[PDB]
Design an enzyme around this catalytic site. Structure first.
Site: not given
Ligand SMILES: [Cl-]
Lengths: 244, 240, 241, 235, 243, 231, 195, 250, 111
Positions: E29-31, E46, E74
């Site tokens: 997943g995204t930060t 993010e 995330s």
């Protein structure tokens, strides 16, 4: 999920047999032999205890023969624990009928309901069947003296003489040979013991490895008596027929 | 509660548990139904590997559902009791609400519906039983014979057989039963039924059961000697 | 071999899921120790905070179950906290139902019974934890009772748990052979804590700063944990002797 | 084994796809819609000559304005019909009117996906639902065990379906009379059936606004069979 | 083997492989990050701009629990929403019975016990999210990070997602360079910088920045989103540092 | 492979295969497009038939006077989810006398789909949805995936060959977003968008399905001769 | 409802039951049969609350008929009476109890003896040579105490019964429109048409 | 969620064996030895206290348990399984007997209730059998003294004397040579200590051995006076000191 | 003891012509001897050219109108936007009312 660990106890084989029922019968075939013989004036129940130890308390013991009510008894072959579950249900069922109709339960009605319980465990619920076969010996005023048997499938049938447990094939042949319809109780007592003595896996049949019971009209006038034999009484009946 | 879906479709579109239940029926003792001009006869095989039986008390193969309808079966004996019990209860319930006994079609439709329910309910297996249901509708003299099977399908038959070697006796009935002229009497109907069982049975001794149903709750079971007379008569005509 | 996935018997009469739960016990790589004084029961455990971004005050494996009972856990923190919340609820209910504070040994038996159920019932996994309960019981005095994933429990003169538990155990055994008694013959809890740290240092062969340890102390009518400075005070005392 | 409500990698439900194979084994059923009515016809297919064919019931009434034909595991259809009849009568009780053919079909299709680990498996039967209402006139619907239903001008289901459907593609136009549709069902049934078509092994039915849903007699169908044979010989 | 096919099964190591597999979904997943400050906490995340067709500012990922707690995560976004929905139920029942708003450590254990419960049975799947959350209560500011196993600790700074290592390194520098403490407004600027720096590990698609904060002085102890002038100011600070 | 038997199982790389297989059912579905301006929001859908004798499967469903969606994948699953939306829109009206925000509608669908991906016995929904609506913050377009993921967009498309329309809308973004106070032109742009996903087949009168909602327009669907204007 | 009587003689049980059904100030019917055949040699008459009576009677009838089919056997009058008593004894502690009083007349084929059981809505069972429910007993019991002998014939029993009906027609306030009389013996159940 | 394991985990194999029961008996075989001997005026039950650590206080772990004032139990196999069975056994003696009849159940019937609980763990959904064999000694007015063995299957048998667990085969043979029907209680305690020494390896004293009797009534252990019919418990646990006294004249 | 019913007064009137129909009602709402409102409408347009009033206990009256309006909405959803005829509306309202037979809506309804 838990699907992974399911044995599926209530399914059919490709040949149309119930796996678990078949395997439960295989278990029962190793249990001590039990014989029932129906005479014109009574019924005999004889059963062989599973390999005994000399330090077993023999008189205060019950393994094979159980009383359901004053007019009905059963001989057991299979798991004793499983049988006691079913025996207590049968005892209660008999009392429900007596409470409802004020009459002792007809033998077949009791046998049917106990057999119907066994059937249910093979069609639904995902549980293992009861590893037990019964010989029912009883009396009622409709059919008189009656012998039945039921097995894990929940199927039951009536008999003049029958065996369950170990060596049924050999035992049934011997009973089929010497049984006749005008037979008396005392003759049937002898046939039951003689059959066990020849089919036993032990060296010699002794009093301490047997359970015995009669259901006669040998009380006083038109009534039925259940006699669960004491150790000394089995010792005497074994001498009286010349087996020991 | 035990939930498992035991009856399910396979890649080829078969429900194996229902089909395996049919194999249990194929293993069971043969049963045959033949309907005449004014009666229906139900015949049943009894295997003879069991001597020392007590026939007084042993469960009979043909069961009365009501005073005017009977049910015979092939397959698992324990399973059949459950169907018979449910049918007998529905029979009394129908009399209670409709104030009229069940038609043979209705009683059959109910029994078949029960069997079907056990093919798409979780935690249960199908009944290893096919039934022959015969009788006469209230105030009606037209004979009725129906057949059910584990899947749940049911249908009416002029004559039909189920159980082991049923394909042999069905073959016999297919050439020996005339639709244009059914067995005109009771004697004719019983004989054709006994004949068809003798193609498969063995000895005509204590191996064949016969039950005759006539209109207006007239049902009776034949004894050994009565059946034995049909067996004796058929064999003497055969030696020709 | 599905007999290794759920809690049913293997052919040799073993429960592999229970055995593997015992191995989860050491996943944290932390050693704990418990000893008894005349008036108190001291428990100590290692404190390892590897990440610099962690708030060190929130990293703990010692729990205050009730006012009188404390519990240290050897095993992963999620299971540890699961056990702690249940123990707290059980001890609270006991007090409400029966009108007196739940004894350390009774809570131990109850948590052990719960663990036993998971070894017999299939849908519930065992918790991968070993629970050490400590108190000064009003009837039995200083008490140490320990529970494992098998459902086993017993009282202790003293005990240790973790990867290097055997070293600590024999170290304690050898002391009690010498002293000839069931406990630390000391008046104050401060010196019983000092004994505990001293004998852990000898057995493990490592030195400890104030942030490498975690200490719980049970006295009559209260169990409490020590601050970093309380431990530092205790470390100074050992060094000056 | 595996879950009953599992998806295949291609994004289809295994059990639904397998039940579609069961339906392909079933006996043929055909329906044609006209402006004068909707016709429903089925192959009876008796398994043995001793079986009394008139007891084979594969065309069924739901209400006076709605009829139904089936193909596949026909025992599975009993509870579907029971639900359909209750739905139709219940709507009449609640609203004092006839229920729309599309609404009935949607109600039946709601049962379809109510299986899993609700019933243990999907239905093994497809239904052709034909009826009339005041809003959308004469209608024919194909109801599957997937829970999906399509309206059709004409449709065949069962073992002879793909061959019969191709034939229906050529023969159907928007000006067919009821009589023309009756003959067309007979013609196409005779083409895909194993045994030779007659009044005993095939059954016709229709629904019209005026007279409602009617299953034809064996005598009435026999004459339509005779009328069909004569017209094919006449050119 | 087969020990990894069913949740709640111990492997011979003493591990629950299904939980470890859920961690892989989180790493994908995204930060997202969290920074603890003088009198509060700051959260940032993010948001990958997959297409021009995404409406800017209108796919909000940070979530509020009660009025004083913020949550970001995330991994599987739907799993994170389920956890927040439970969090909101837990916080509501606490306030119902005890009147006071739920303390952050109390709230942390409520989520922890719930996630841990999803490692106890084979009939449920573990959560496919690591969740960074916190706020301000009677005892000051708290920041927490919770993982699929149920494990959680208090943090000075926290990070998770594809750029967690980059973000962690940047967080450690702030902890070392500011032993006395970081201000709320400073932490917002730093959060922007760290997300931009952590974006290097996801640089195919350009992204959208989203920040929120709770501060005793700046937001009066309540959770608010950073928007408008304060957001653009934080973006510009981050842009200046990458060049 | 060994990890796709049910939804309750993670793969070693952290994937849920049953959810991915459900996503695959959407890709097989017929194309549908969604787009909006500041005043109106439009759905365009290509309907699919079984053959020339059959009807064309309806793709668009009304949820409230101000909201509705289009579907791609398992239609019965769209019926279940649209029925849930109808109830939630309705609960908001009866209890709070409030038109349900299109955003909340998305959040509710997300949480309903999610529960079916974490429990034994169940299965994921096998359908994708494009929800349009006009509420107190103007026009909206949402994209629902049965993984649970819901996304707000200016325009989008789902189904087979949806990438063609999705690229076109990405180019046309600056044009169609400013088609304010002009319904017919916003539809024309959506019809031109869906045309970029056609192969061998063209838009006919019983093939095309259009829906619109906006400032002074209730959610209404156009079929048959009412879409002849746009071919 | 209202009047139900029963007399056991040497070889049979005779039940008499009133024909009127009255609701308000109107006699709605004057030919009502307040009885159900439970089995070929067992008959039950009933009286009590409207609706409850027929519902209970038919429910018992269904159960006994179900038993008969299941076992291919007829329950004894004693057995049937005990089943009925227990159903009423259950009922009396229900949310809405059956307010029905019954007489059960049967011929036991195994004993070759007639048997009459009186059971009230509470589930109070007694075997009697003669029985009655409601206000009827207040006249008939004393009458039968005087004129009844245990060795009477069916004809003597019917004359004894005529004496009861006459007394009730003289001293009872309400017009009960006569009685339907039925006999239970070794040959089953039959109705006397001219009474 | 919820227990989806509604199906049996013990099923019949093609050969007719019930696997889980067999495997449970195997667990019992591994367990530490315990025995029971019946005298004319009493019953003795005994076992070794296998300590897990010398730091552990083995007094806090009781292998011999009081079920009723006249009934005691001991086991071989899995300790935790035994502990919960003792809890359940004590409760069922009250719920299904004392709360009904106002007196304690006779030995055979309490045994019967424990057997039922163990049988159900052999057939019910989502559970394994109990991994223990029990020996239950007790007294009641109409049956006198008795001794029973209960196995994982739920089966139970009455014994004059027997042993279970690790060295049961040798111990049973030892008991056959020494047992007669004229044994007094003290003679039975002596034989119990002799038999146990064969199976015990390490220390053999009152701290490593656990032993209890069912004998005469103990008025001093009742806790109150004033009711003539209440005369005290027949169950008594021998102290560490009482065992060592008998180990000198061994 | 709590009394769940009240009386809000007012009166309503419906007349039908050859190609039209009127449904009138006063706008006064009361409890006991007080006026709650001089203008509180109780005649409503329910869609599909059906007007409705449920007069008596206003809380029950509002609840019923609310449920019927909602019934019209779901009739469209479930039966392809079909117009609900006045006779069908009537039968539907019967079931709404009888559904609370043992705890009635205290209103006289006219459509
Ligand atoms: Cl407990």
């Amino acid at each position: 999920g838990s699907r992974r660990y399911d044995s599926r106890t209530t399914i059919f084989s490709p040949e149309g047999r119930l796996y678990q029922v078949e395997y439960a019968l295989e278990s029962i075939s190793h249990a001590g032999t039990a014989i029932g013989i129906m005479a014109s004036d009574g019924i005999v129940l004889a059963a062989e205890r599973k390999v005994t130890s000399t330090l077993l308390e023999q008189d205060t013991s019950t393994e094979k023969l159980y009383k359901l009510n004053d007019k009905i008894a059963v001989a057991v072959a299979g798991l004793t624990a499983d049988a006691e579950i079913l025996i207590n249900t049968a005892r209660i069922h008999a009392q429900n009928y007596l409470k409802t109709y004020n009459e002792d339960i007809p033998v077949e009605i009791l046998v049917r309901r106990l057999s119907d319980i066994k059937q249910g465990y093979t069609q639904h619920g995902g549980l293992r069947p009861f590893g037990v076969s019964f010989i029912y010996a009883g009396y009622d005023d409709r059919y008189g003296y009656q012998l039945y048997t039921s097995n894990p499938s929940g199927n039951y049938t009536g008999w003049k003489a029958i065996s369950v447990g170990a060596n049924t094939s050999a035992a049934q042949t011997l009973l089929q040979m010497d049984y006749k319809d005008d037979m008396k109780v005392d003759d049937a007592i002898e046939l039951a013991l003689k059959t066990l003595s020849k089919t036993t896996d032990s060296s010699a049949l002794t009093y301490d490895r047997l359970e015995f019971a009669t259901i006669r009209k040998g009380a006083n006038d038109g009534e039925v008596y259940q006699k669960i034999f004491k150790p000394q009484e089995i010792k005497d009946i074994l001498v009286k027929t010349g087996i020991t | 509660g035990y939930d498992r879906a035991l009856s399910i479709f396979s890649p080829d579109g078969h429900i194996f548990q229902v089909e395996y239940a049919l194999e249990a029926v194929k293993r069971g003792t043969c049963a045959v139904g033949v309907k005449g001009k004014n009666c229906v006869v139900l015949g049943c095989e009894r295997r003879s590997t069991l001597k020392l039986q007590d026939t007084r008390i042993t469960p009979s193969k043909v069961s009365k559902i009501d005073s005017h309808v009977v049910l015979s079966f092939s397959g698992l004996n324990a399973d059949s009791r459950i169907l018979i019990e449910k049918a007998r209860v529905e029979a009394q319930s129908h009399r209670l609400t409709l104030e009229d006994p069940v038609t043979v079609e209705y009683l059959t439709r109910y029994v078949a519906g029960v069997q079907q329910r056990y093919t798409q309910s979780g935690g249960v297996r199908p009944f290893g039983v096919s039934t022959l249901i015969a009788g006469f509708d209230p105030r009606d003299d037209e004979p009725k014979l129906y057949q059910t099977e584990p899947s749940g399908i049911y249908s009416s038959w002029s004559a039909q057989t189920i159980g082991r070697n049923s394909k042999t006796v069905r073959e016999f009935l297919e050439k020996n039963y005339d639709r244009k002229e059914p067995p005109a009497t009771v004697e004719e109907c019983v004989k054709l039924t006994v004949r068809s069982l003798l193609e498969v049975v063995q000895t005509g001794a204590k191996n064949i059961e016969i039950t005759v149903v006539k209109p207006d709750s007239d049902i009776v079971a034949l004894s050994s000697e009565e059946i034995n007379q049909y067996v004796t008569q058929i064999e003497q005509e055969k030696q020709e | 071999g599905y007999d290794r996935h759920i809690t049913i018997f293997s052919p040799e009469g073993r429960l592999y899921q229970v055995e593997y739960a015992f191995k989860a016990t050491n996943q944290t790589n932390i050693n704990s120790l418990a000893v008894r004084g005349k008036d108190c029961t001291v428990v100590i455990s290692q404190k390892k905070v590897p990440d610099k971004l962690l708030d060190p005050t929130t990293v703990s494996y010692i729990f205050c179950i009730s006012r009188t009972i404390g519990m240290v856990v050897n095993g992963p923190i999620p299971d540890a906290r699961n056990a702690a919340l249940r123990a707290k609820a059980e001890a609270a209910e006991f007090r409400y139902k029966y009108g007196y504070d739940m004894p350390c040994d009774v809570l131990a038996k109850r948590m052990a019974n719960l663990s036993q159920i998971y070894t017999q019932r299939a849908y519930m996994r065992p918790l991968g934890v070993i629970l050490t309960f400590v108190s000064v019981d009003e009837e039995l005095g200083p008490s140490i009772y320990k529970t494992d994933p098998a459902g086993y429990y017993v009282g202790y003169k003293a005990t240790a748990t973790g990867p290097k538990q055997q070293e600590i155990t024999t170290n304690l055994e050898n002391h009690f052979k010498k002293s000839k008694i069931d406990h630390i013959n000391e008046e104050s809890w401060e010196k019983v804590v000092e004994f505990a740290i001293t004998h852990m240092i000898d057995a493990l062969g490592t030195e400890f700063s104030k942030n490498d340890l975690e200490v719980g102390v049970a006295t009559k009518d209260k169990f409490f944990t020590l601050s970093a400075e309380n431990i530092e005070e205790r470390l100074v005392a050992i060094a000056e002797q | 084994d595996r879950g009953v409500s599992t998806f295949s990698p291609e994004g289809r439900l295994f059990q639904v796809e397998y039940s579609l194979e069961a339906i392909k084994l079933g006996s043929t059923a055909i329906g044609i819609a006209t402006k004068e009515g909707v016709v429903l016809g089925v192959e009876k297919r008796a398994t043995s000559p001793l079986l009394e064919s008139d007891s084979i019931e594969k065309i069924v009434e739901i209400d006076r304005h709605i009829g139904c034909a089936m193909s596949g595991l026909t025992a599975d259809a009993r509870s579907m019909i029971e639900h359909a009849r209750t739905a139709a009568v219940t709507h009449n009780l609640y609203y004092d009117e006839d229920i729309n053919v599309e609404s009935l079909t949607q109600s039946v299709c709601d049962l379809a996906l109510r299986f899993g680990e609700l019933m243990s498996r999907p239905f093994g039967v497809a239904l052709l639902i034909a009826g009339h209402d005041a809003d959308d006139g004469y209608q024919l619907f194909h109801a599957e065990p997937s829970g999906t239903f399509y309206r059709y001008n004409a449709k065949a289901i069962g073992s002879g379906s793909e061959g019969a459907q191709a034939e229906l593609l050529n023969e159907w136009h928007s000006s067919l009379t009821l009589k023309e549709a009756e003959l067309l069902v007979l013609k196409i049934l005779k083409q895909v059936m194993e045994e030779k078509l007659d009044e005993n092994n095939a059954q016709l039915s229709c629904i019209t606004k005026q007279d409602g849903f009617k299953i034809y007699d064996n005598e009435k169908t026999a004459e339509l069979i005779k009328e069909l044979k004569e017209k094919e010989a006449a050119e | 083997t087969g020990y990894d096919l069913s949740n709640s099964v111990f492997s011979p190591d003493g591990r629950n492989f299904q939980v470890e597999y859920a961690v892989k979904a989180v790493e994908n997943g995204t930060t997202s990050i969290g920074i603890k400050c003088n009198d509060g906490v700051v959260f940032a995340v993010e948001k990958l701009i997959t297409s021009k067709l995404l409406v800017p500012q209108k796919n909000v990922k940070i979530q509020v629990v009660d009025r004083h707690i913020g949550c970001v995560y995330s991994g599987l976004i739907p799993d994170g929403r389920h956890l927040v929905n439970r969090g909101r139920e837990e916080a509501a029942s606490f306030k119902k019975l005890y009147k006071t708003p739920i303390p952050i450590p109390a709230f942390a254990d409520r989520l922890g016990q719930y996630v841990q419960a999803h490692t106890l049975y084979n009939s449920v799947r573990p959560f496919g999210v690591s969740t960074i959350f916190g706020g301000v209560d009677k005892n000051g500011a708290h920041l927490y990070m919770l993982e699929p196993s149920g494990s959680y600790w208090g943090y000075k700074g926290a990070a998770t997602g594809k750029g967690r290592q980059s973000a962690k390194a940047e967080l450690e520098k702030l902890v070392d360079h500011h032993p006395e403490g970081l201000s709320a407004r400073e932490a917002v600027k730093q959060a922007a910088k760290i997300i931009y720096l952590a974006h290097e590990d996801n640089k195919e698609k350009d992204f959208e920045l989203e920040i929120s904060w709770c501060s005793l002085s700046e937001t009066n102890g309540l959770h608010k989103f950073v928007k408008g002038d304060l957001l653009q100011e934080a973006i510009d600070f981050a842009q200046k540092e990458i060049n | 492979n060994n990890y796709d038997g049910d939804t309750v199982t993670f793969s070693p790389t952290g994937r849920l295969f049953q959810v991915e297989y459900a996503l695959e059912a959407i890709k097989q579905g017929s194309v549908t497009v969604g787009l909006r301006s500041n005043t109106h929001a439009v759905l365009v859908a290509l309907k699919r038939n079984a053959d020339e004798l059959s009807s064309y499967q309806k793709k668009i469903i009304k949820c409230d006077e101000h909201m509705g969606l289009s579907l791609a994948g398992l239609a019965p699953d769209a019926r279940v989810l649209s029925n849930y939306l109808r109830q939630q829109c309705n609960y908001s009206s009866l209890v709070f006398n409030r038109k349900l925000a299109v955003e909340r509608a998305g959040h509710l669908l997300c949480d309903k789909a999610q529960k079916n991906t974490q429990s034994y016995g169940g299965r994921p929904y096998g359908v994708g949805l494009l929800i349009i609506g006009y509420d107190k913050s103007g026009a909206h377009l949402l994209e629902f995936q049965p993984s649970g993921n819901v996304t707000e967009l200016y325009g989008t498309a789902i189904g087979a060959r949806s990438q063609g329309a999705k690229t076109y809308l990405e180019r046309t973004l600056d044009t169609f977003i400013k088609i304010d106070g002009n319904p017919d032109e916003l539809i024309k742009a959506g019809v031109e968008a869906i045309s970029q996903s056609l192969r061998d087949e063209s838009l006919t009168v019983d093939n095309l399905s259009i829906a619109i909602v906006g400032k002074d327009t209730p959610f209404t669907i156009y079929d048959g001769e009412a879409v002849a204007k746009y071919i | 409802m209202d009047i139900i009587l029963g007399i056991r003689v040497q070889d049979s049980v005779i039940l008499a039951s009133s024909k009127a059904v009255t609701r308000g100030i109107s006699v709605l019917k004057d030919s009502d049969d307040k009885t159900r055949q439970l089995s070929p040699h067992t008959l039950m008459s009933f009286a009590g609350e409207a609706g409850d009576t027929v519902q209970f009677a038919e429910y018992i009838q269904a159960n006994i008929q179900l038993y008969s089919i299941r076992e291919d056997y007829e329950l004894s009058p004693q057995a049937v009476s005990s089943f009925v008593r227990q159903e009423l004894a259950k009922s009396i502690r229900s949310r809405r109890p059956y307010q029905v009083n019954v007489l059960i007349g049967g011929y036991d084929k195994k004993k070759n003896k007639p048997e009459l059981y009186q059971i009230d809505y509470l589930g109070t069972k007694v075997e009697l040579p003669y029985g009655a429910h409601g206000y009827s007993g207040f006249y008939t019991f004393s009458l039968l105490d005087h004129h009844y002998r245990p060795d009477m014939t069916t004809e003597e029993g019917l004359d004894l019964l005529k004496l009861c009906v006459q007394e009730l027609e003289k001293r009872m306030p309400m017009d009960f429109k006569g009685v339907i009389v039925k006999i239970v013996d070794k040959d089953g159940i039959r109705q006397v048409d001219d009474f | 969620m919820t227990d989806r394991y509604s199906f049996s985990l013990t099923t019949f194999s093609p050969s007719g064996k019930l696997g889980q029961i067999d495997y449970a008996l195997t667990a019992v075989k591994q367990g530490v030895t315990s025995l029971g001997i019946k005298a004319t005026n009493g019953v003795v039950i005994a076992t070794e206290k296998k300590s897990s650590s010398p730091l552990a206080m083995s007094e806090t772990l009781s292998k011999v348990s009081l079920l009723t004032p006249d009934i005691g139990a001991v086991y071989s196999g899995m300790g935790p399984d035994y502990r919960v069975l003792v809890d359940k056994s004590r409760k069922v003696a009250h719920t299904s007997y004392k709360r009904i009849y106002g007196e304690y159940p006779p030995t055979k019937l309490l045994v019967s209730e424990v057997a039922k609980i163990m049988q159900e763990a052999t057939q019910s959904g989502g559970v394994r059998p109990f991994g223990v064999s029990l020996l239950i000694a007790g007294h009641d007015e109409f049956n006198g003294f008795s001794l029973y063995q209960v196995d994982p299957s739920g089966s139970y048998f009455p014994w004059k004397a027997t042993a279970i667990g690790k060295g049961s085969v040798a111990a049973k043979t030892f008991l056959e040579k020494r047992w007669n029907d004229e044994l007094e209680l003290e003679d039975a305690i002596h034989i119990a200590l002799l038999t146990l020494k064969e199976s015990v390896e390490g220390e053999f004293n009152g701290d490593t051995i656990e032993l209890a009797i069912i004998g005469d009534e103990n008025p001093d252990l009742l806790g109150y006076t004033g009711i003539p019919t209440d005369k005290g418990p027949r169950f008594r646990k021998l102290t560490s000191q009482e065992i060592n006294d008998r180990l000198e004249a061994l | 003891q709590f009394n769940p019913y009240g009386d809000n007064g007012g009166t309503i009137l419906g007349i039908a012509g050859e190609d039209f129909a009127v449904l009138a009602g006063d706008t006064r709402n009361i409890t006991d001897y007080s006026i709650n409102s001089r203008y509180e409408p109780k005649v409503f347009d329910c869609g599909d050219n059906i007007v409705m009033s449920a007069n008596g206990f206003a809380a029950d009256g509002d609840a019923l109108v609310k449920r019927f309006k909602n019934s019209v909405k779901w009739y469209h959803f479930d039966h392809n936007d079909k117009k609900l005829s006045i006779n069908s509306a009537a039968r539907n309202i019967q079931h709404l009312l009888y559904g609370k037979r043992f705890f009635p809506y205290y209103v006289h309804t006219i459509i």
